[PDB]
RNA sequence: CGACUCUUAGCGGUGGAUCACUCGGCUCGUGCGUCGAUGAAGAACGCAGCUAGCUGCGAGAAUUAAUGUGAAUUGCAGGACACAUUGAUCAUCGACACUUCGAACGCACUUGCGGCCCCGGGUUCCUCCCGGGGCUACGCCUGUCUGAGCGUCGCU
RNA sequence: CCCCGCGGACGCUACGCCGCGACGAGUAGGAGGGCCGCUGCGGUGAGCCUUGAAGCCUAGGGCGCGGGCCCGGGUGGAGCCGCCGCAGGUGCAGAUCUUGGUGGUAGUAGCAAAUAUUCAAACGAGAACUUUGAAGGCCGAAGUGGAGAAGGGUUCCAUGU
RNA sequence: CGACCUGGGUAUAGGGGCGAAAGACUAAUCGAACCAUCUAGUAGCUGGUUCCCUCCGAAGUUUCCCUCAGGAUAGCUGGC
RNA sequence: CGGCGACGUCGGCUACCCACCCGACCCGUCUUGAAACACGGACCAAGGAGUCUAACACGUGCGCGAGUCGGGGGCUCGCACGAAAGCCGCCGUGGCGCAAUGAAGGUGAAGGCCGGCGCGCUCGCCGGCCGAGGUGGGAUCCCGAGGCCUCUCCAGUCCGCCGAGGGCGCACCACCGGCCCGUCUCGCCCGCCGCGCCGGGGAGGUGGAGCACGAGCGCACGUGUUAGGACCCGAAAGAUGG
RNA sequence: CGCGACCUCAGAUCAGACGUGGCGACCCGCUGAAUUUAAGCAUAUUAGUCAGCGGAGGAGAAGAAACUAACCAGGAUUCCCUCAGUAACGGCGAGUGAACAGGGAAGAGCCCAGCGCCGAAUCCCCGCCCCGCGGCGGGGCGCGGGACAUGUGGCGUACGGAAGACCCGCUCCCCGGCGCCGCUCGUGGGGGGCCCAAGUCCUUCUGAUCGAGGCCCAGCCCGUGGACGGUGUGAGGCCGGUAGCGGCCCCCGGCGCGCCGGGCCCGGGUCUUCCCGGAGUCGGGUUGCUUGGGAAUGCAGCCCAAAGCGGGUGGUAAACUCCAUCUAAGGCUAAAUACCGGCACGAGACCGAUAGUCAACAAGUACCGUAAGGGAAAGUUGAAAAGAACUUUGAAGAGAGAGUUCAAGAGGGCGUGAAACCGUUAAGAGGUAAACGGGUGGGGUCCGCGCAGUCCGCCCGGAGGAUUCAACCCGGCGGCGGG
C-alpha cells in the first residue's frame, strides 16, 4: 500500500532471488591469484613485454566515442603490408595481426604503419641460437638494452 | 610469532592432534630435559623417553633427588612409571603413579646404537644453528 | 547458519481438531521426535527467527578524503602530551615528544639492540605497561582463538625496511607502520586518538611530501591538501581575555536574587 | 496440649537450570580436482586368545610384504622382541592379496540347474563318479573364418 | 604609588553550576533519557582472581522513583569485570506456545468375562501362588488333548541368579 | 448344497482401481490413499508479540474502492 | 536544659512471622462495555516473535563542493594481524549533478540606461556603460538630530551610552514584469553558393516536473513505505515424482 | 548347370579392443508445473523455475562473424563495471525486460569438404631382426594379408589459393637419451623423513604449581623464536612446536649446453595464366512454444521449395532504387569464468550441549512403518583410581564404623547443583479460601565489635624537649619584565 508520497518503485524480486546470489567474499582471494598469474607469466617470457604485443591505434566507432582514439584487436593485412613484414612472421615478432579489419581511411593507414615500423626500430631480436647471430641484432646492445617492458606495449595516447 | 599458513594456531585443532597422536609421534611429544651434566657432556637439551633409564621427579608430589629408573612409558596414558614413585591402595599392595616426563629430568640415558645416533644428530644441529648464529 | 537447519524435517500441522496447538508436528510414532514441534522460532531443534545470512553487507566504504582527515587527525594528536598521556602510554621520560631516531635504527637486526634502543630512549616503560597488562581474556573469545589479550605499544613508523621488523615484532605492543602506507586502525587503536609514536628520521622528512603543507599541496598523492581550520586560535581564555571582547561586554550580574517569602 | 493447614528459615531429598569447559558444528577462503568389466558406488557375510557395538580388514581377514622410525602394545594374559648373522611399535604405502551379491557377465535367484576344455584320484581310459583350474552377458568397431541370396555379372 | 603584618572559603565535568515562575490523568500511538540489563569486538583500567573467578543460596547491610546495583556470610573451584567506542540471534507470564521436570487429584479409580479350591511335607531367610503326595473340581474327543502350515527366531534343553 | 464358507498363488494403483451400488472398499486413512518435495504455499481471519522513567497524546468521521471483519484519502497525533 | 546507658538495655519505619483498622473481584485479550456464566492460563526451568537484503522518501552527522564518487580493475616484503591498509589520475570508463521542453522532427533559458538618428512607426542602426528587474514586508548592519556625566563656570580638546528619524537590505513570502520549450491567434520583415512546399525573426493568450549568479555528490545513522519466508504460529487446498 | 567376381546380408565362447554402472556442487541437451501475485480470475506472474529424463570434464558450454554499426567506423569466445530497471513487452494492469558503444580480466588462432596437381604418394593388421621396454615406439625386411579410385595422403580454405617465369635471400626443424648445468626464483620446484635458543635459578603460596616477590653492571637468559597446545594454576625459557634466502637424507619434474638416433629439406616479392566453395539447406506459408523483440526474437512440426554480380543482415508489413556489411546450411581451439559433491588445508566480531549439522557420544544409530520413508534422546568423578582394604548387622539390596583424597557436603548417569514439588526441624498463626495495598503494634533473627559519646583551626595558662625563628652569606632552580 502507498502511504503518502514517494516513487512507483518495482523491485525485481519475485523470481526466488536468494537461490541465485553473487557473493564476493572471494573477491581479493581472486585478485591475488590474478596478480600471481601475470608475475608468472611474465617472469615465463623474460624479455618480452610483459603484457601482450603491440596493439593498433583504432578510432571508436559511434558519434558519442568517435572523438577519442584506443587499441583495436590488432594490425590489419593492409599495414602489415605497406610495413613490409609478413602476416605470419608478424605475430611471432609480437606484433598481433587481425585480419579482418579493414582500413578506409589513409590517416588511420598511415598512423598504424608509423607506429609499425617505429616498432620494428625499438625491436630487439635475440637469436634463436645464441651461438651464431645471424640476423637478429647485436650483442653488445643485447646485453644491457634487453629488459622486460612492463605495462601496455607503446599506449595510445589522445 | 607463527607466519607459516600451513601449520595452524587453533586451539581445537591442536588439542586434537595432540591428543590422537599416533605412537610414534607420541614418543616424541613425551620428551623429558637433560640433566646439567648430560647437557654439558651431549649438546642437546631435550631427548625422547626411553624405557629402562634412570631419572627424577622435579614437579609434584614426589619431588627429589632419588633417582629412579623408567619401569614403564605409558604412551595410551601419557605417562611414565618410575621405581620407587608409587602409592599404596586400600588392600595394601603398591602401584605405580604416572607422572609426565616433561615434569622429570634424565639423569643417565639408556644408549643403543640408534640413542647415539640420535644424540649425535641433535648435536649436529646445534653446532650448525650456533655457527650460523656466530 | 546453515540454510537447511530446523528444515530437513518433513513435519505436518496436526489440525486443529485434537487438543493441542497447531504447530507443525514431526511425523511417525516410533521415536521421541515424533510428535514434536517443529520449523518454528519457538520450537526446540526449530529454525530460528531470520536466519542469519552471508549477504549482510559487511563493508563499509569510506571516502578517500575523510580517510586521509582522520589520519592527519591521528598524526596531529600524536604529537601532543596531554592526548597520548591521556591514552595511557607511560611518556614521562621521553624527550621531545614527536620522538625522532636517525636512520641507524632502520637496519636493526636483533631484538636485543632493539630493546637497548627503547630503554635509551626511555621508551621501554611503556613496554613494561604492556607486559604488565597480559592476561586472559573473558568469555567466548577464548573457545574462538582470542585466548589471551594486552594493552598497545608504542608505533614505531619507518621509511624503509633494512631489518627493522625483524629487529621489533617480537616486542609485545610493538607496530611497524611504514610511513608510506599509515594505518588508522594502528594510529587510532581503540577509535582514541593518541598512540605514543616513534619515528625514524627518513620517515619524518617524507611526511611533509606524503600529505604537504598547507602552502604547498603533497607530492605523493597528486591531489590532497591539508584539511582547514574553522578555528585558527582555538584557545578560549586569551579570546575571551582578549581586550577587545571585555570593552564590547556589559559588567556581570552576580549576585543572587533567590525567592523573597511573602510576609 | 497433640493432629491438620499456612508462612519463613536451617538441613535433607526430587530435578537438572545456571555457570565454566569443548577432539563438535556453522560460515568464509585456498590448493587440488582422482571412480568403474584390470569389476565401481552400495549391500551381505565373515575375520581378534578373551570381542557385542563402533572401527579396521577379506579365508594371507582389528591384516602380509616393503620403506621410514626406533622399544613398545596394554583391560588381562601370552610369548616374544640379541635393536648387527638386522628391529617392538607406529607411520607411510609403491609389492602381494582382496569372500558373496551388485553395471554383475553361463541360465535363474531356489547357495537351484547346466555346457565345453585341461589336471589329479576312483579309472587302472573307456569313460561313468569325486575334487581342482580356465572359459561360457549384451551391444558395438577393425580384421578372420564359415556361409546365404531366381541381387548384378563372367566362363564354360 | 595599600599594608605592624604579605593574607583572604567554595566554585566553572560550560555536555558544568546556579536562580526564578508555571505546570504534572492517560489507552492506541509518537519521541527523549537511561551511571537499566545480556552477549561478543577494538581501546583502556601497571584492573580483579587458587590468600579463591563465574554460578548459586541467604531472617545480613544498604543505594536508586524505577529498570536494577553494590557490599557481608555460605557454597563453589578458574576464570571475570569497570570506563570510551563498535555489533547484535540482546530482556517474557501468557501464543489450546516448544522441550524437560514436577504437583493436587491420590494411596484414589482400579487389579470383578469363561463354577474352585483344600490338607500335609520338602527346599528355602522368606510360601495363598514353587515342587511332591493326598482330596475336591473343570476342559469332556467340534477339548483347556496330540501334531502341523504361515508367522516368530532360539522363545527349545540343562544349570545357576 | 449354495448367487455357499475359506487358505495359498496371481491380476487390477490414485482422478486410478474395484463395487449385487452403501460414495462402499482400496493396510484403523476415502465425496479422491499414503510418502517426499514445490513449501516457511496464501490468509483482508484468530492467537501471541519480552526493560524502566519522562514528555506529548487520539479515532471510530469525509470522499473513492466487487467496499460493508479491508484499504486509499482528508481530518485527529507525534517528532524535527 | 533534663534522664539513661553493657552481659542488661539503646537505635535500626528497610527485612521474617503474627495481630488489628481502612481499602481491596484474576490476570492477558477482543470489545461500546470483562470479575464475568467470554476465550487462554495446574506449577517451575530453559527456548520463544519487526530481522537481513535491495529500492525509495525525508530528517540528522560528516568530507569535498559545480562538482562528487573508485564501488570494478591495477600497483605495492613473502598472506600473523593483513581477505586489512595505502596508492593510481592519460585508470573518472561510468553514475548522479550542472537544462528544460515536445509524441516527435527538433529547439533550447540577460535584462536595464544614455544619445543621436529610421518616422525614436509601441519601433530598426549602433555608441556608451552596468549586469538577472521591480513593489510590499524583512533578522542583521550603517548614518543619525537630540541628549546622559566630572567641586564649578569660559572655550574645545578624547572616546562611551540612550536615541526620534533616515539608509543599504540576507534568507524567505506575497505580487508584477522578463527569458527557454510545446500549442493557438494576428501580422510584417529579414538571410542566401542552393531562391526553396527553404531558413530565421515579432506581438498577444495559453500547456511545462523550467530559467532568473548553481547544491550536489559520496558516506553514516534514524524513521516511514515497499518486494522478498518478511514480527512469530496457523488452513480448506493446488502441483510433481514415487 | 558347376566354378569364380562383386554386392547385400548372417553366424561364431573367432583375434584384438570399446560402451554399460556410480557421484552429480558447478556444466550441456530436453521436459516441465502449481502454490503465489494480480487484494476475485482465465492472458499475464510464479518460470523456462521445482519435480522428471538423458550426457560430461576438472571445469563445461561458447568461440574465430551469413557480427556490430551507420561512426573519422569497430573486429572470435567467456567473465566484471556500466549501459539500465533503460529501449522494449505487458487484461499497456500486476508486473517483466535485454543489446550496442565505453572501461577492464584474459587474449590465440586455425583445420577440412569442394576446385585442382601429384604413377594411392595414404592407412590398418600379422610375422623378422635388431635399438629399446617401462603407459611400449624407431628403423629397415616380407614375390605377407586387408582397407582404399563409391577417393587415402601431400599442397591448399575465403586473410584468397595454385602453376610458370624474373629478382633476392642460403638465410637452418622437431621430436629421445648421455654428462653436467643453470643450480629450479619468492628465493627448493615439488613430495617424504629427522633435527636445531633460552630458568624448571633464590625465597615463598598451594593438594599440585604454569602464581607472587628477587636476580649487581642497566640490569636473570633467548628473542629473525613473546603463535599455539600439553604439563596436577595463569609457562617466551619443562615438552612438542614457533622464527629462520636454517641443517641433513631419499624420491620425482620442466628447464641450457658438447655428443649421439632418426627423419626434414625453399622462403619472400613482381608479372602472366588459371581456380574458387557446404541443399529437403536457405527462404516463404501456417501451426505450437519461446523472447524485451513489438504486422511475428528464436526453436520445432507440416506444406512449398531456391539462387549465383547470388545469399543473409540493415529491430514497422510491401514494391522500386542506391548503399553498407558479412559469406550460412562442415570441424577444432587455451586463458580470463563457475563449483552447497570429493581429497587436504587455513581462518572467524559465528554457536556453545533445548544452542551449533539430525548427529560433540557404538547417529542416519536405537526405534517406527508392508513399503516409499520418518528418525531421536544421550557430554563433564578425580591431578592421579588413590574406584573405599578391614570390622560389624542383614539372605541380600542397604547401613554403621574405618580408609583414600585438598575435597566423597567429588563414591562409576559421580564438576556446580536453581526453581517447581516433598520430608523433617525451629518459630509464629489459624471458624468469613488464600493472597494483596496503606497504617501502626507485638515477637524474633541479625546489624551498629552501640553502650559514658565528638572532632579540630586560633588564642590563654601550666608543665617540658629540640633544632634552630627572623635576618643575612653562598650555590642550585623556577615565575615575571626588559628599548
Ligand atoms: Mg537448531
Ligand atoms: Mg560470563
Ligand atoms: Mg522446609
Ligand atoms: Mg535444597
Ligand atoms: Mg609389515
Ligand atoms: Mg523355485
Ligand atoms: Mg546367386
Ligand atoms: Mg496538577
Ligand atoms: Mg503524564
Ligand atoms: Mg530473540
Ligand atoms: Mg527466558
Ligand atoms: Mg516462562
Ligand atoms: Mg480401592
Ligand atoms: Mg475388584
Ligand atoms: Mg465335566
Ligand atoms: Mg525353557
Ligand atoms: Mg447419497
Ligand atoms: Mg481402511
Ligand atoms: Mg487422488
Ligand atoms: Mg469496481
Ligand atoms: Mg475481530
Ligand atoms: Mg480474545
Ligand atoms: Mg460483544
Ligand atoms: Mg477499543
Ligand atoms: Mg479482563
Ligand atoms: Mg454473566
Ligand atoms: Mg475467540
Ligand atoms: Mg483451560
Ligand atoms: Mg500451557
Ligand atoms: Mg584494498
Ligand atoms: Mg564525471
Ligand atoms: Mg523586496
Ligand atoms: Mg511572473
Ligand atoms: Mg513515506
Ligand atoms: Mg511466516
Ligand atoms: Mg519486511
Ligand atoms: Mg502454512
Ligand atoms: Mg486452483
Ligand atoms: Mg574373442
Ligand atoms: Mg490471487
Ligand atoms: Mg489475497
Ligand atoms: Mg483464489
Ligand atoms: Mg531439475
Ligand atoms: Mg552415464
Ligand atoms: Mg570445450
Ligand atoms: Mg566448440
Ligand atoms: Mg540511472
Ligand atoms: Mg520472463
Ligand atoms: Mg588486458
Ligand atoms: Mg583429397
Ligand atoms: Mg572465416
Ligand atoms: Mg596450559
Ligand atoms: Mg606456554
Ligand atoms: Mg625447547
Ligand atoms: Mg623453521
Ligand atoms: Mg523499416
Ligand atoms: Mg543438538
Ligand atoms: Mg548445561
Ligand atoms: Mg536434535
Ligand atoms: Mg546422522
Ligand atoms: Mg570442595
Ligand atoms: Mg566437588
Ligand atoms: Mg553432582
Known amino acids: 500500500a502507498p502511504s503518502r508520497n514517494g516513487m512507483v518503485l518495482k523491485p525485481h524480486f519475485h523470481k526466488d532471488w536468494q537461490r541465485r546470489v ?19 607469466k611474465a617472469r615465463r617470457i623474460a624479455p618480452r613485454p610483459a603484457s601482450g604485443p603491440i596493439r593498433p591505434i583504432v578510432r ?26 609478413h602476416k605470419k612472421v608478424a605475430r611471432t615478432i609480437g606484433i ?7 582500413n578506409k581511411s589513409t590517416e588511420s593507414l598511415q598512423a598504424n604503419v608509423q607506429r609499425l615500423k617505429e616498432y620494428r626500430s625499438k625491436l630487439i631480436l635475440f637469436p634463436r641460437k645464441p651461438s651464431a647471430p645471424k640476423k637478429g641484432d647485436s650483442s653488445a646492445e643485447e646485453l644491457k638494452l634487453a629488459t622486460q617492458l612492463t605495462g601496455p606495449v607503446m599506449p595510445v595516447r589522445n | 610469532m607463527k ?20 605412537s610414534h609421534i607420541r614418543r616424541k611429544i613425551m620428551s623429558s630435559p637433560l640433566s646439567k651434566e648430560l647437557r654439558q657432556k651431549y649438546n642437546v ?12 621427579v622435579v614437579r609434584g608430589h614426589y619431588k627429589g633427588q632419588q633417582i629412579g629408573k623408567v619401569v614403564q612409558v605409558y604412551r595410551k596414558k601419557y605417562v611414565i612409571y618410575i621405581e620407587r614413585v608409587q602409592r599404596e ?40 644453528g650456533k655457527e650460523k648464529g656466530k | 547458519v546453515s540454510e537447511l537447519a530446523g528444515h530437513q524435517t518433513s513435519a505436518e500441522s496436526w489440525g486443529t481438531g485434537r487438543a493441542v496447538a497447531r504447530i507443525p508436528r514431526v511425523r511417525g510414532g516410533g521415536t521421541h521426535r515424533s510428535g514434536q514441534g517443529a520449523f518454528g522460532n519457538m520450537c526446540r531443534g526449530g529454525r530460528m527467527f531470520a536466519p542469519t545470512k552471508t549477504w549482510r553487507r559487511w563493508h563499509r566504504r569510506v571516502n578517500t578524503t575523510q580517510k586521509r582527515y582522520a589520519i592527519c587527525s591521528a598524526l596531529a594528536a600524536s604529537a601532543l602530551p596531554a592526548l597520548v598521556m591521556s591514552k595511557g602510554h607511560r611518556i614521562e621520560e621521553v624527550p621531545e615528544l614527536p620522538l625522532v631516531v636517525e636512520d641507524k635504527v632502520e637496519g636493526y637486526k636483533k631484538t636485543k639492540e632493539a630493546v637497548l634502543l627503547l630503554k635509551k630512549l626511555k621508551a621501554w616503560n611503556d613496554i613494561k605497561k604492556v607486559y604488565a597488562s597480559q592476561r586472559m581474556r573473558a568469555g567466548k573469545g577464548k573457545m574462538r582463538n582470542r585466548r589471551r ?17 625483524k629487529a621489533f615484532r617480537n616486542i609485545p605492543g610493538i607496530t611497524l607502520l611504514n610511513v608510506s602506507k599509515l594505518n588508522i586502525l594502528k594510529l587510532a587503536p581503540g ?13 619524518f622528512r617524507k611526511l611533509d611530501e606524503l600529505y604537504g603543507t598547507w602552502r604547498k599541496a603533497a607530492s605523493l598523492k597528486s591531489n590532497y591538501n591539508l584539511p582547514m581550520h574553522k578555528m585558527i586560535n582555538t584557545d578560549l581564555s586569551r579570546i575571551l581575555k582578549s581586550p577587545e571582547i571585555q570593552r564590547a561586554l556589559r559588567a556581570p550580574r552576580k549576585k543572587i536574587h533567590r525567592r523573597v517569602l511573602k510576609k
Open chain 1, 22 to 40: 553473487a557473493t564476493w567474499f572471494n573477491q581479493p582471494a581472486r585478485k591475488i591469484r590474478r596478480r600471481k598469474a601475470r608475475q608468472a
Open chain 1, 60 to 85: 571508436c566507432p559511434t558519434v558519442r566515442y568517435h572523438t577519442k582514439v584506443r587499441a583495436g584487436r590488432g594490425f590489419s593485412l593492409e599495414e602489415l603490408r605497406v610495413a613490409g613484414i
Open chain 1, 96 to 102: 598481433s595481426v587481425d585480419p579482418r579489419r579493414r
Open chain 2, 3 to 22: 607466519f607459516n599458513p600451513f601449520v595452524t594456531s587453533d586451539r581445537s585443532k591442536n588439542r586434537k592432534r595432540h591428543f590422537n597422536a599416533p
Open chain 2, 45 to 56: 637439551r631435550s631427548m625422547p623417553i626411553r624405557k629402562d633409564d634412570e631419572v627424577q
Open chain 2, 89 to 128: 591402595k586400600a588392600n595394601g599392595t603398591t602401584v605405580h603413579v604416572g607422572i609426565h616426563p616433561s615434569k622429570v629430568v634424565i639423569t643417565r640415558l639408556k644408549l643403543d646404537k640408534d640413542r647415539k645416533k640420535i644424540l649425535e644428530r641433535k648435536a649436529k644441529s646445534r653446532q650448525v
Open chain 3, 149 to 165: 589479550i594486552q594493552r598497545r605499544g608504542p608505533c614505531i613508523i619507518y621509511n624503509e625496511d633494512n631489518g627493522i621488523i
Open chain 3, 191 to 203: 577509535g582514541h586518538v593518541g598512540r605514543f609514536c616513534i619515528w625514524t628520521e627518513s620517515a
